[PDB]
């Protein structure tokens, strides 16, 4: 069966932005559509990069599951839970993207991730992670303890390194910082290898299709 | 701006409760606020007593958990506190105030306040 | 959880003070700090660590680090001696410091 989106665009339910909550009994999915122009894009706010390719390529595919990759509860060194913010609200509280998880220091420290997931799926994933955009320094400080952070994202197809920029930006939902997200395909033999010592967005949930 | 008034009986006898409701003008109870209610003996700290959302949602101080009680009334546009089994450690000046959420990590900031009313506890 | 502060602290008129608020693992929570003048309600001067509401004067400033926030005034008056609570939150509970008593030696 084909996902239709009533107030929520693709971005938005694939990172699973708390104000779009519409009722979903059966978990299992053709392709997924985004019709006219959706209520809510992204709660925090900030950038999809690639979009338009990714939208294409959710509309080309018969079959689409969610699955956990890696359980939140496995960060032993971060906090996986603390971070999140009055722009994505949960039952009047401050909230974050479902699948996808804020990862901010814990005590004083932010020790470096070296993390890597292998696909070990019969199908391909979509796997989808970001980087956040501080505010000041002193934001940059308060999340992570490290002022000079990156992020690397190795695939055997791509090699990315993210360097957050600390700017002040115009005050959307609130907020005057911003997140940048990123996709790509991990083939079923494929792993994806992560790197941060801070300003990292990591994946919780990913999604298996089927061309 | 918004105002925040407390009011109820001054004096209440030991395992009575505690019961008081506090007015908001200038603003309306269904925001992205919460209410909160907040005491001090005299002389002493503030001490948090718990919170509500315009949808029901609560939060209670863990200690005063078992005989505490908050609720809304968005017609009246008021929200009330009920804090049952008093002893005279429950005397005190109750102040309602209004919480907002920081725009990054948890918790919140609390203003306005109401004036504040003693209520003593005594047979 | 609990807020420590020192009981008083006295400055010299156009000093500067520094009030201290301790905690567990403080500097990952963002600090406010509020002003009691007697038989008067909170006033707060300084909230998510750094900033102040419109109507405080450029006075007064905060900072945190560590476990150990600080409320700052600058060139103070009269009008600032008060009682000053910190405040923070942990697991669904608010949490209010032990209180400082400024006094300005007049």
């Known amino acids: 069966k084909p996902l239709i989106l009533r107030d929520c665009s693709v971005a938005g339910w694939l990172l699973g932005n708390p104000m779009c909550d519409e009722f979903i009994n059966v978990p299992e999915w053709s392709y997924i559509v985004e019709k006219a122009n959706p209520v809510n894009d992204l709660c925090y706010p900030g950038d999809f990069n690639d979009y338009e390719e990714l939208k294409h390529l959710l509309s080309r595919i018969n079959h689409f599951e969610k699955i956990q990759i890696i359980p939140k509860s496995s960060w032993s060194s971060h906090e996986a839970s603390l971070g999140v913010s009055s722009a994505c609200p949960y039952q009047g509280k401050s909230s974050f993207f479902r699948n996808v998880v804020w990862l901010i220091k814990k005590n004083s420290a932010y020790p470096t991730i070296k993390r890597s997931y292998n696909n070990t799926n019969q199908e391909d994933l979509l796997v989808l992670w970001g980087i956040h955009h501080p505010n000041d320094a002193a934001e940059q400080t308060k999340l992570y303890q490290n002022p000079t952070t990156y992020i690397s994202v190795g695939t055997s197809t791509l090699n990315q390194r993210l360097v957050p920029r600390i700017a002040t930006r115009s005050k959307v939902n609130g907020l005057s910082s911003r997140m940048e997200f990123f996709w790509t395909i991990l083939k079923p033999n494929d792993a994806i290898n992560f790197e941060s010592n801070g300003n990292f967005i990591a994946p919780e949930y990913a999604y298996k299709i089927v061309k | 701006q918004v105002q925040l008034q407390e009011s109820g009986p001054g004096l209440v006898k030991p395992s009575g409760t505690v019961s008081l409701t506090c007015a908001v003008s200038?603003?309306?109870?269904?925001?992205?606020?919460?209410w909160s209610w907040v005491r001090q003996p005299p002389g002493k700290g503030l001490e948090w007593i718990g919170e509500i959302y315009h949808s029901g949602n609560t939060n209670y101080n863990p200690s005063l958990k078992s005989r505490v009680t908050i609720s809304v009334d968005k017609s009246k546009n008021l929200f009330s506190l009920k804090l049952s089994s008093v002893t005279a450690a429950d005397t005190a000046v109750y102040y309602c105030?209004?919480?907002?959420?920081?725009?990054?990590?948890?918790?919140?900031?609390?203003?306005?306040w109401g004036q504040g009313t003693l209520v003593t506890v005594s047979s | 959880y609990e807020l420590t502060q020192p009981p008083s602290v006295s400055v010299s008129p156009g000093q500067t003070v520094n009030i201290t608020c301790s905690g567990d693992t403080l500097g990952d929570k963002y600090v406010c700090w509020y002003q009691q003048k007697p038989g008067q309600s909170p006033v707060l001067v300084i909230y998510?660590?750094?900033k102040r509401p419109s109507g405080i004067p450029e006075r007064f400033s905060g900072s945190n680090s560590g476990d150990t926030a600080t409320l700052t005034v600058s060139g103070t008056q009269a009008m600032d001696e008060a009682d000053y609570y910190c405040q923070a939150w942990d697991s669904s509970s608010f949490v209010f410091g032990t209180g400082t008593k400024v006094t300005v030696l007049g």
């Open positions: 200038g603003g309306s109870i269904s925001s992205s606020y919460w």
């Open positions: 105030a209004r919480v907002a959420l920081f725009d990054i990590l948890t918790g919140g900031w609390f203003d306005p």
């Open positions: 998510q660590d750094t």
